[PDB]
Amino acid sequence: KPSDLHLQTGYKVERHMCDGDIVIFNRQPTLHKMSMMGHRVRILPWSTFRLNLSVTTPYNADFDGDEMNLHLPQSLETRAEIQELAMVPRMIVTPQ
Amino acid sequence: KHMVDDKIHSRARGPIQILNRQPMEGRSRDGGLRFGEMERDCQIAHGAAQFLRERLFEASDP
Amino acid sequence: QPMIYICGECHTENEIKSRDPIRCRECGYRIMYKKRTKRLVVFDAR
Amino acid sequence: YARPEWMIVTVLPVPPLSVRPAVRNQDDLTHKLADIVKINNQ
Amino acid sequence: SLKQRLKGKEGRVRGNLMGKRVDFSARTVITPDPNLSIDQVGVPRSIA
Amino acid sequence: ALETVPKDLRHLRACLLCSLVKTIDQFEYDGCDNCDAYLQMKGNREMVYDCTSSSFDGIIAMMSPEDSWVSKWQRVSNFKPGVYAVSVTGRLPQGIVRELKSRGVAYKSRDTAIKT
Amino acid sequence: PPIDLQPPRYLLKFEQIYLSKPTHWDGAPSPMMPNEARLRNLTYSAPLYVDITKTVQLQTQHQKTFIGKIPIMLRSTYCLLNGLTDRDLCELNECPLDPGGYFIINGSEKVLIAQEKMATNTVYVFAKKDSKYAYTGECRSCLENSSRPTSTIWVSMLARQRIVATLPYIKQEVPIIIVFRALGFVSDRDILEHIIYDFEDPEMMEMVKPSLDEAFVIQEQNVALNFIGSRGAKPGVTKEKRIKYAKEVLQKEMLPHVGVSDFCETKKAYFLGYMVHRLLLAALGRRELDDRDHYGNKRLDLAGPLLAFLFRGMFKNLLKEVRIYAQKFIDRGKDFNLELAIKTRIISDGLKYSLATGNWGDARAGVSQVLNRLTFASTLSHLRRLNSPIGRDGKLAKPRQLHNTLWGMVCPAETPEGHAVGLVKNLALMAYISVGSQPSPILEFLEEWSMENLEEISPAAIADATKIFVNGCWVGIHKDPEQLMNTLRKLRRQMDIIVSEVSMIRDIREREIRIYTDAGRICRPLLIVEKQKLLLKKRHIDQLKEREYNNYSWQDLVASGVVEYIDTLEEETVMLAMTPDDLQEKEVAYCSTYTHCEIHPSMILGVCASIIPFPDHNQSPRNTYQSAMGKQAMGVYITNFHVRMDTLAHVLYYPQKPLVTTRSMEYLRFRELPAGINSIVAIASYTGYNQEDSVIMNRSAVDRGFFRSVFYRSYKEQESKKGFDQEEVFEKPTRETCQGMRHAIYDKLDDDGLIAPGVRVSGDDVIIGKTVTLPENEDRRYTKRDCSTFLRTSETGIVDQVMVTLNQEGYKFCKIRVRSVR
Amino acid sequence: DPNLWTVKCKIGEERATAISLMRKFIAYQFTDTPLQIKSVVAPEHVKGYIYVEAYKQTHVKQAIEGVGNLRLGYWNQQMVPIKEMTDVLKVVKKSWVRLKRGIYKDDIAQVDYVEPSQNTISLKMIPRIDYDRIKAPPQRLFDAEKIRSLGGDVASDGDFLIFEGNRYSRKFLFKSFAMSAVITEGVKPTLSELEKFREHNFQPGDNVEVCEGELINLQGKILSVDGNKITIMPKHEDLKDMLEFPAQELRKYFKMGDHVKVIAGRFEGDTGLIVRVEENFVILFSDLTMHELKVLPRDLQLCSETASGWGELVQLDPQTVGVIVRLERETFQVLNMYGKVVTVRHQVTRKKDNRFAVALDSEQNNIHVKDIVKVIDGPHSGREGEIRHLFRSFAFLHCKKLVENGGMFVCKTRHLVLANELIGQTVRISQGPYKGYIGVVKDATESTARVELHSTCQTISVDRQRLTTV
RNA sequence: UAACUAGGGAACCCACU
Ligand SMILES: [Mg+2]
Ligand SMILES: [Zn+2]
Ligand SMILES: [Zn+2]
């Protein structure tokens, strides 16, 4: 009923994820720390994970039926943590 | 035979196993993905200990 | 109320009942095929 | 914390229903515990 | 047994405590796209 | 001989004197195969019901009592081979026991059970 | 053996068997067509009758007593559709394209994968370089048509130089000389005659001298057999019953292929002398060591030997149960009832379990796999698959590699590229596994000619003549090996006595000639080259083009002495021309001593590596990867796919034959049930969506039906009449009546709880309304619970067709095939 | 002396094995294959295996040859040890009985009439039957009218009756059964079986004194427990040693002002504090009520758990709800919205509770569940209770001080103060970009509706103004 | 005047990386 769809400050709303949300994207086998990195969501129509070309090389993912795993960070705190540690611009230069 | 509608699945707090309260296995029973040992090692390497707590405790079986 | 099934090898049709053993009347063939539905179908020709 | 006489199991802990489940259908651990309690009463 | 329930790679320590099934995760095929930045992944709508 | 051995499992009765286990047909037709001359239950059913038992525990197929330690513990070494009872519940009346003692046969009980 | 019971004795004997035609039933005997057995989840199995004869003596015979049902693979000689015309098959809803070769067990199509093994009855010399043994010989001895399994004897030289023997059922390392004395050969000179055939090479005698000087203490047969019986797996009581156990082990355990009889002492002695002699030649290096991966050293257990190995144990268990029943009903003094003696479940349910599950026993697994019906190429490639018995996850490479003797018998390219590279293989095209015949006509033919048997020779004329073996067992000597091999080949190029599959091998360097008649060897046909000319003349091509008129077949050409089957042992002694246009013309001559010519080199490839255009221009991992992918391509997998209720049927709208084809696709019938479409590709860098193994497709082409496929999925469900506590029944469940009813649409169902065909369903739509009763409906107002099968979630589509029938148990049983175009 | 050897046998067929071995001994006692064994023992209660008396194991193996029932002990034999051979032949040992076989196994039967022929006795039983209705079971009363209604094998003699396998009943089964088919020793029925037809309880942690002897008035905490002579080890006040006392010397003494529970009698289940300890009358007040409960000293124990003292919404009928105020054995005591405490059966329905429901008081303030409200009008005017359940116009109030009905009552809410159709219907999109598509409505709202399209592999949502049903 | 959750396991086989 529409009487309990009101919102005051302090409720949580588990909303469907939009553009600009942060996700963790990895490939088994996760060998090093650039095999599991943080991307920003873009909503595209068809039913695959369109990801960019230069991120193939840390993932070792050659698109011939490779499927990847996508984790969503649920708290806002871990969202900021992934944004400040595990972004793919912050994982360009490897320590190895 | 490997089509993408046969392989796509997502999951959010669906069915849960009875032996331990972890999510199911496989997309046929609406199960979730496994956050295995090597991903635990990789998130130690990132130092995302709050993300590692969120994966291994809160968003799996609190 | 009876359901019409097509009698497999016989290709004839017959009524069936609830809790009825599945047998044709022509030769007692055990495999029945249910007739195509009576509601409408519509296909986009794409 | 650890005493050598406590190693000899003179009373056996049977774990609860959260550990071995029931699904009508019993768990393998419940079958072995049935063997335990049957031979104990014998 | 209990020791066989705990000792395996499919056991409790490695199979359930170390690596466990997680909610909020998706798995589908990747296909390329050069028209989006290196930190963007294009997820489907029915996943989102 | 085979005449001592019971024919079936139904109505097995042990004697009160020597714990001989036979069927009621064999007590009716043969009496006691050890000491019927002292008891005389052949030709009388009521003498069998007075002189045999309806409650017994354990059987022993005593085949050679001359070289048996079980016959030494059950005191049946001087008897004939046959089917014997370990524990016998029952007792002869005082007339039969006094008549046996007048013939020099004191009645030792075969109730060797540990009653509590 | 005819089982005997001691009271008046009586024995039972089974003499003449009867194998009916597959028939189902309660019901009347009627011929069960195999598609009906597929649809009702029946088992396409023929009943098996035998006659009984008992003597109690007072004999009575009992003709045609029902032993039990054994499964039949389709297109056999005992299937219903043997030799039927294609019109008749299409009347039976069976396609003529289906090759058969699979069992129908509970509606499931099962394929017995051929299992490799080491070749039995054959002496091998290997080197355990890590153990205490320098060179170890072995002979996995197994007599043909013997219910007991193989029993490997080892004869091994110690590394330090004594020689010992590991016998079956004896746990200590028995010396060789002890065994030779235990066979009734007391002299050292006689044993040395049986071991070393020349007394003029003092080096080999000096090498056998320490092993001979180990056991000069034991001189008697009695003491020798006593030392045999000492440390047995069943140890001996005293001198008595241990002499007999050791005599039993030497009679019936080591070397059954040289015979199990009282007069077989000296034959067993000669063959053990051969084992020790070959071990001495290996310790000299005069003969090279033996390879475990040479495919002359292996056999292929097909469905014949596998079902025989299964039926040995299960027929023995049925005899054991008849003996238990007879032991019960003789001690009551009565007469047994023989129809209750033979219980049929132990001989039929065991076959059904070993074929349905694949757990090959009551042992190993994965023997009977479910047939792969995605593509006709995958169906053919699953019926021609060999499994190495070597287990997985091994870090070694030698059982996995492509050995040299895989030429022409097995495909070099096709192998599963996962953790079973090389272990699982796919047979080549023209290769054929020899089904084996009896050796007795060959032994009669050899005794007809001047072959001298072992029980009538001096041991002096052995080394100047050639030792002749049949199926491993050494049958005698012959003096003139040429004109014996010419005679045996002259009989095989005519099929007078010797079958075409049987193989002769003249070892020329070491004076041996061995004839194999085993069941499991792997041969392939080759042309025959006299002096430097093929025997395939123009008149054979003229009679062979005009088939269906002259009735001139392949078998007439085998009978003409033009082609013949060569197996892998005999390929070691053949000089094989590749192609005749190069290799019989005079040049700077390579050999000019060719014996056989390859028919066509493209017949070295498998069924999936035959559909590759120009596969010699590729790189070989690419050929292997295509051999994997060709089993996975969508296509019209069978012609009768509209009848079949397969789970996961992938068929295609407009499949095309390849414009670029091979000649060998004509014989796999790939142009009749193809898999894939000819497409105008371009190889271009473009917008950047064909980047890292991906391809850009044409949307307008796809809108014109390009690779638009259709995916069928069936769904089976039956109800279960049980002991009234839970009772499934198909009905449309009602919210007010049924409990636990999940929130979905139930008005799609018909009145019987099923979907009528032609109805759109989607994820978590119901397809089968089934309710199971609840025992506490009286123990209120809330009755039978929903037990319904939903449509599989995240799938959708139209219901193609629904069949309603009865199962094996007589319970109602529905299958629903749901169609979704892709 | 010979020794005893275990031979495994068929279960339940050990006496017949000894009979067959005795016949086999007598049948071959003059032949050239003699049984060299001495005796065969098959006891009364040892089930599964028998004993062979011999000097050798080989004599046992050559004597048991040809016996199939011992074939699982044929290959190997195990000797009974020398000290343990007397344990073989050692034997240990208007009323009520319990029947041995049948469906009435171990059921209490009152011995009505002992027939002096020593074959059977007449037994009064409670029938475990289903009255020929399920079979083509617990104990319940014999219903003669139900078995006259259902028919079958039934014969009526007023209250006397014969039924279903010659079962003899009257008013209650009265059927003859054998004395060897019942156990006439060791039944000991209970008080509920008397309606159908000393003791020591010391616990570890309880406090006890000593009433007699040289160690009198020594109060100590219980460590262990035994049956009759306990030899207890009590931790007394100001004594580091552990003394010894049996059960007849001790008594459950308790200091005034402690946790007490009652073990048995009328007062069981209830807890509290005792007040004044007399010679034997020990008076206490409960955790629930402040009523005086006077107990024997033996009927007290020391347990530090909180008392139990539940309160569900059940439907008396679909017009009036109820609230359970007492849980009983076969009934519920239920307080409805009317205020009428009723007693109804276990088989009322569970109504979905509305924990977010809103109500109005007498002063138009919003009130909810768990709200402490004062009653200013009505029959309960003056009390103050907590709202536990809600109705359209009624509210249930709990109060721990009010001892009636577990604290529950009801008041009207206006006397208080705070202190779809389209689902599964084939539609046709008649407007918009998807115009002309036939689908089935999966979900539907006031505004939009999700349509499973028959053509595409996709479920899309459109307005209800765009849909047109077939 | 809308009654709202899901249930097993163990083995083998195949496929993807
Ligand atoms: Mg890849
Ligand atoms: Zn018909
Ligand atoms: Zn007597």
Short mmCIF file of all heavy atoms in Angstrom, two decimals, chain F residues 15 17-18 32 39, ligand 3:
data_model
loop_
_atom_site.label_atom_id
_atom_site.label_comp_id
_atom_site.label_asym_id
_atom_site.label_seq_id
_atom_site.Cartn_x
_atom_site.Cartn_y
_atom_site.Cartn_z
N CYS F 15 13.14 -81.07 33.65
CA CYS F 15 12.83 -81.82 34.85
C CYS F 15 13.25 -81.04 36.09
O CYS F 15 14.13 -80.17 36.04
CB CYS F 15 13.53 -83.18 34.83
SG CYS F 15 13.18 -84.21 36.28
N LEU F 17 14.41 -82.64 38.83
CA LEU F 17 15.42 -83.42 39.52
C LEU F 17 16.78 -83.34 38.83
O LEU F 17 17.77 -82.92 39.44
CB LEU F 17 14.96 -84.88 39.64
CG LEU F 17 15.90 -85.84 40.38
CD1 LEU F 17 16.10 -85.41 41.81
CD2 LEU F 17 15.35 -87.26 40.33
N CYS F 18 16.83 -83.72 37.55
CA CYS F 18 18.08 -83.77 36.80
C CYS F 18 18.14 -82.75 35.67
O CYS F 18 19.08 -82.79 34.87
CB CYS F 18 18.30 -85.18 36.25
SG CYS F 18 17.05 -85.69 35.04
N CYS F 32 11.02 -89.97 32.63
CA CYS F 32 12.35 -89.38 32.71
C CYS F 32 13.38 -90.37 32.21
O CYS F 32 13.35 -91.56 32.55
CB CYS F 32 12.68 -88.95 34.14
SG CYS F 32 14.27 -88.11 34.31
N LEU F 39 11.02 -91.60 40.22
CA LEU F 39 9.96 -90.60 40.12
C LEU F 39 8.63 -91.14 39.62
O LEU F 39 7.59 -90.77 40.17
CB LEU F 39 10.41 -89.45 39.21
CG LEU F 39 11.51 -88.54 39.76
CD1 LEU F 39 11.97 -87.53 38.72
CD2 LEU F 39 11.03 -87.84 41.03
ZN ZN J 3 14.71 -86.16 35.86
#
